[PDB]
Scaffold this active site. Structure first.
Site, PDB file in Angstrom:
ATOM      1  N   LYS A 182     -52.209   0.852 -14.476  1.00  0.00           N
ATOM      2  CA  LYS A 182     -52.697   1.095 -15.839  1.00  0.00           C
ATOM      3  C   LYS A 182     -51.933   0.194 -16.823  1.00  0.00           C
ATOM      4  O   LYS A 182     -52.528  -0.410 -17.721  1.00  0.00           O
ATOM      5  CB  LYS A 182     -52.461   2.577 -16.208  1.00  0.00           C
ATOM      6  N   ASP A 229     -57.755   5.611 -19.541  1.00  0.00           N
ATOM      7  CA  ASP A 229     -56.978   4.742 -20.419  1.00  0.00           C
ATOM      8  C   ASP A 229     -57.494   3.317 -20.468  1.00  0.00           C
ATOM      9  O   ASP A 229     -57.433   2.683 -21.517  1.00  0.00           O
ATOM     10  CB  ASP A 229     -55.496   4.734 -20.029  1.00  0.00           C
ATOM     11  N   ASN A 272     -56.206   9.387 -25.217  1.00  0.00           N
ATOM     12  CA  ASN A 272     -54.776   9.679 -25.327  1.00  0.00           C
ATOM     13  C   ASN A 272     -54.043   8.530 -24.643  1.00  0.00           C
ATOM     14  O   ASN A 272     -52.976   8.713 -24.054  1.00  0.00           O
ATOM     15  CB  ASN A 272     -54.384  11.010 -24.665  1.00  0.00           C
ATOM     16  N   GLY A 283     -51.729   5.792 -24.816  1.00  0.00           N
ATOM     17  CA  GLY A 283     -50.692   5.184 -25.629  1.00  0.00           C
ATOM     18  C   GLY A 283     -50.696   3.671 -25.497  1.00  0.00           C
ATOM     19  O   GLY A 283     -50.482   2.941 -26.476  1.00  0.00           O
ATOM     20  N   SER A 285     -39.925   5.085 -27.687  1.00  0.00           N
ATOM     21  CA  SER A 285     -40.898   4.430 -26.804  1.00  0.00           C
ATOM     22  C   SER A 285     -40.657   2.947 -26.715  1.00  0.00           C
ATOM     23  O   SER A 285     -40.409   2.289 -27.725  1.00  0.00           O
ATOM     24  CB  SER A 285     -42.348   4.623 -27.295  1.00  0.00           C
ATOM     25  N   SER A 321     -37.019   3.240 -21.371  1.00  0.00           N
ATOM     26  CA  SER A 321     -38.092   2.670 -20.557  1.00  0.00           C
ATOM     27  C   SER A 321     -38.045   1.152 -20.512  1.00  0.00           C
ATOM     28  O   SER A 321     -39.080   0.473 -20.498  1.00  0.00           O
ATOM     29  CB  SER A 321     -39.443   3.126 -21.119  1.00  0.00           C
ATOM     30  N   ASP A 347     -42.077   8.125 -15.663  1.00  0.00           N
ATOM     31  CA  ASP A 347     -43.345   8.657 -15.168  1.00  0.00           C
ATOM     32  C   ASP A 347     -43.224   9.093 -13.712  1.00  0.00           C
ATOM     33  O   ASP A 347     -43.520  10.239 -13.370  1.00  0.00           O
ATOM     34  CB  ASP A 347     -44.455   7.613 -15.303  1.00  0.00           C
ATOM     35  N   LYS A 387     -45.140  12.647 -24.624  1.00  0.00           N
ATOM     36  CA  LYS A 387     -46.189  11.964 -23.875  1.00  0.00           C
ATOM     37  C   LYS A 387     -47.467  12.793 -23.780  1.00  0.00           C
ATOM     38  O   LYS A 387     -47.787  13.473 -24.756  1.00  0.00           O
ATOM     39  CB  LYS A 387     -45.622  11.496 -22.531  1.00  0.00           C
ATOM     40  N   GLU A 388     -48.189  12.776 -22.656  1.00  0.00           N
ATOM     41  CA  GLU A 388     -49.466  13.505 -22.592  1.00  0.00           C
ATOM     42  C   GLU A 388     -49.386  14.948 -23.025  1.00  0.00           C
ATOM     43  O   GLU A 388     -50.352  15.492 -23.572  1.00  0.00           O
ATOM     44  CB  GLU A 388     -50.086  13.385 -21.205  1.00  0.00           C
ATOM     45  N   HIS A 397     -52.687  14.185 -16.514  1.00  0.00           N
ATOM     46  CA  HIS A 397     -52.917  13.706 -15.146  1.00  0.00           C
ATOM     47  C   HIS A 397     -51.732  13.935 -14.216  1.00  0.00           C
ATOM     48  O   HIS A 397     -51.923  14.367 -13.067  1.00  0.00           O
ATOM     49  CB  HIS A 397     -53.267  12.196 -15.150  1.00  0.00           C
ATOM     50  N   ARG A 398     -50.512  13.662 -14.684  1.00  0.00           N
ATOM     51  CA  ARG A 398     -49.371  13.814 -13.786  1.00  0.00           C
ATOM     52  C   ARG A 398     -48.981  15.245 -13.464  1.00  0.00           C
ATOM     53  O   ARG A 398     -48.356  15.495 -12.432  1.00  0.00           O
ATOM     54  CB  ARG A 398     -48.173  13.012 -14.316  1.00  0.00           C
ATOM     55  N   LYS A 432     -57.143  10.190 -16.195  1.00  0.00           N
ATOM     56  CA  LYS A 432     -56.488   9.348 -17.191  1.00  0.00           C
ATOM     57  C   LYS A 432     -56.003   8.044 -16.532  1.00  0.00           C
ATOM     58  O   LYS A 432     -56.101   6.968 -17.138  1.00  0.00           O
ATOM     59  CB  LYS A 432     -55.292  10.061 -17.850  1.00  0.00           C
TER      60      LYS A 432
HETATM   61  O1  LIG Z   1     -45.697   0.143 -21.537  1.00  0.00           O
HETATM   62  C1  LIG Z   1     -46.273   0.824 -20.656  1.00  0.00           C
HETATM   63  O2  LIG Z   1     -47.147   0.396 -19.901  1.00  0.00           O
HETATM   64  C2  LIG Z   1     -45.825   2.247 -20.467  1.00  0.00           C
HETATM   65  C3  LIG Z   1     -44.553   2.619 -20.934  1.00  0.00           C
HETATM   66  C4  LIG Z   1     -44.046   4.038 -20.804  1.00  0.00           C
HETATM   67  O3  LIG Z   1     -43.940   4.654 -22.122  1.00  0.00           O
HETATM   68  P1  LIG Z   1     -42.530   4.846 -23.000  1.00  0.00           P
HETATM   69  O4  LIG Z   1     -42.018   3.471 -23.261  1.00  0.00           O
HETATM   70  O5  LIG Z   1     -42.935   5.542 -24.252  1.00  0.00           O
HETATM   71  O6  LIG Z   1     -41.620   5.650 -22.108  1.00  0.00           O
HETATM   72  C5  LIG Z   1     -44.857   4.870 -19.786  1.00  0.00           C
HETATM   73  O7  LIG Z   1     -44.461   6.257 -19.895  1.00  0.00           O
HETATM   74  C6  LIG Z   1     -46.365   4.664 -19.977  1.00  0.00           C
HETATM   75  O8  LIG Z   1     -47.109   5.437 -19.029  1.00  0.00           O
HETATM   76  C7  LIG Z   1     -46.683   3.180 -19.793  1.00  0.00           C
HETATM   77  O1  LIG Z   2     -48.677   7.667 -17.632  1.00  0.00           O
HETATM   78  C1  LIG Z   2     -47.762   8.479 -17.987  1.00  0.00           C
HETATM   79  O2  LIG Z   2     -47.136   9.199 -17.219  1.00  0.00           O
HETATM   80  C2  LIG Z   2     -47.410   8.566 -19.425  1.00  0.00           C
HETATM   81  N1  LIG Z   2     -48.266   7.692 -20.230  1.00  0.00           N
HETATM   82  C3  LIG Z   2     -48.057   7.643 -21.659  1.00  0.00           C
HETATM   83  P1  LIG Z   2     -49.160   6.561 -22.422  1.00  0.00           P
HETATM   84  O3  LIG Z   2     -49.538   5.518 -21.449  1.00  0.00           O
HETATM   85  O4  LIG Z   2     -50.379   7.355 -22.856  1.00  0.00           O
HETATM   86  O5  LIG Z   2     -48.381   6.079 -23.588  1.00  0.00           O
END
Ligand SMILES: O=C(O)C1=C[C@@H](OP(=O)(O)O)[C@@H](O)[C@H](O)C1
Ligand SMILES: O=C(O)C[NH2+]CP(=O)(O)O
Length: 427
Positions: A22, A49, A94, A96, A169, A197, A313, A340-341, A385-386, A411
């Protein structure tokens, strides 16, 4: 309320060809849309997503075609920033990755666009990104609660000195990094304090380089970006399999294998969640690494106490795998599970207790003491989803488990349950 009941799984063994990542999919789609030339993405993920990102690109005027299974996408690059006016509303569910990335990208030039989504998305923070974009010149209005979507973007991001908070984030920094190269002026992005992250920033830089852009990374504290650049189509690009989606299957083998091999990711993957395999190894499982696979074979399973900020995650998968481990497991430095979700620390603690575990819900950690034996529970999934995928692992015990709203896995992984069933064996 739909539900699915999983009967006890005696053993797992087999091979799963992973759905696309994703994280990689949504970055690759936005970069392909901004780039010059035609990009052909293969192994693209078909999930909510990614669908929201595809719908947004359609609304913005980007042309593309999808294969029958929606995993091959031929995108006609726009050759520059995307545009729309008239307060065009883009509904982003949803997602992000779509909300944060588009909130920044669409600040280039002039535009009049509104970004919104599902109720939960209006509760997920975005203030740190908005603050940074405004320092760079963007005009952004909060239409409801300050610091959260929905947002009305009226453009103006030109570059300059931009500070960004990286404590909630990493997506805010990712969005800025992808956007800044196309701004007219050079941009110096300074991280205020901690950066959570962190591995996802490496995914962002990797994708940007694929699309022809590099920046100066000063130990993840400051990033120097030259403006006036253009993204270029890489031609055909293969999206890695999803390492977060892989976690459930590797954990299943660590608990009840057998050997489960996942293909589409391997030792060379850019995703930080391949490090989830290292956690399983630390717990006592055997891991094999290949160029295009990772496999896990049952060994033993001992509790661990680890900082999981690098794999937030996939770390949720350790929380339910902990039900099968010897000892008390503690997962630390995972505060953003709360934004998050769903608030995942509250949700995970609540549902784990339902199957018998003693759980301490820390402010930014979770401590799990497994019961001698699990009991049946109807698991609530919080539109997450998780939560559904993590709790499916409860069926690797002597008790069945009922999962509410199983389609919430769409998702990121619509076919999750059929894939789990593929490796579920009766003997
Ligand atoms: O940049 C990305 O692809 C993601 C970053 C993470 O979010 P955070 O940076 O808010 O932890 C992760 O939880 C999300 O599923 C995907
Ligand atoms: O995939 C996950 O576990 C959390 N995703 C948060 P998002 O991708 O919606 O910002």
């Amino acid at each position: 309320m739909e539900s699915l009941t999983l009967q006890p799984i005696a053993r797992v063994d087999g091979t799963i060809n992973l759905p696309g990542s994703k994280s990689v999919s949504n970055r690759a789609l936005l970069l392909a849309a901004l780039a010059h030339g035609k990009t052909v993405l293969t192994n693209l993920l078909d999930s909510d997503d990614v669908r929201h990102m595809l719908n947004a690109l359609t609304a913005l005027g980007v042309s593309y075609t999808l294969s029958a299974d929606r995993t091959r996408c031929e995108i006609i690059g726009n050759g520059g920033p995307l545009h729309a006016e008239g307060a065009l509303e883009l509904f982003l569910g949803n997602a992000g990755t779509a909300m944060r990335l588009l909130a920044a990208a669409l600040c280039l030039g002039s535009n009049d666009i509104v970004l919104t989504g599902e109720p939960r998305m209006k509760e997920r923070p975005i203030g740190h990104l908005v603050d940074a974009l405004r320092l760079g010149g963007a005009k952004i209005t909060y239409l409801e609660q300050e610091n959260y979507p929905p947002l009305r973007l009226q453009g103006g991001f030109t570059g300059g000195n931009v500070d960004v908070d990286g404590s909630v984030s990493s997506q805010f920094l990712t969005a800025l990094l992808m956007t800044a190269p196309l701004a007219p002026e050079d941009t110096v992005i300074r991280i205020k304090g901690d950066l959570v992250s962190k591995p996802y920033i490496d995914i962002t830089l990797n994708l940007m380089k694929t699309f022809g852009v590099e920046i100066e990374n000063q130990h993840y504290q400051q990033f120097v970006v030259k403006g006036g650049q253009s993204y270029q189509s890489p031609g055909t690009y293969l999206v890695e399999g999803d390492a977060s989606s892989a976690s459930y299957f590797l954990a299943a083998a660590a608990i009840k294998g057998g050997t489960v091999k996942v293909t589409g990711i391997g030792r060379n993957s850019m995703q930080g969640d391949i490090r989830f395999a290292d956690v399983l190894e630390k717990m006592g499982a055997t891991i094999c690494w290949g160029d295009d696979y990772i496999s896990c074979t049952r060994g033993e399973l001992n509790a661990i106490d680890m900082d999981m900020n690098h794999i937030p995650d996939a770390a949720m998968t350790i929380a339910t795998a902990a039900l099968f481990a010897k000892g008390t497991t503690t997962l630390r430095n995972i505060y953003n599970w709360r934004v998050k979700e769903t608030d995942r620390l509250f949700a995970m603690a609540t549902e784990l207790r339902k199957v018998g575990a003693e759980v301490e819900e820390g402010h930014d950690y979770i401590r799990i003491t497994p019961p001698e034996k699990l009991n049946f529970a109807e698991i609530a999934t919080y539109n997450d989803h998780r939560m559904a995928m993590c709790f499916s692992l409860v069926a690797l015990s002597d008790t069945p488990v009922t999962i509410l709203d199983p389609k919430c896995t769409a998702k990121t992984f619509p076919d999750y349950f059929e894939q789990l069933a593929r490796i579920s064996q009766a003997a």
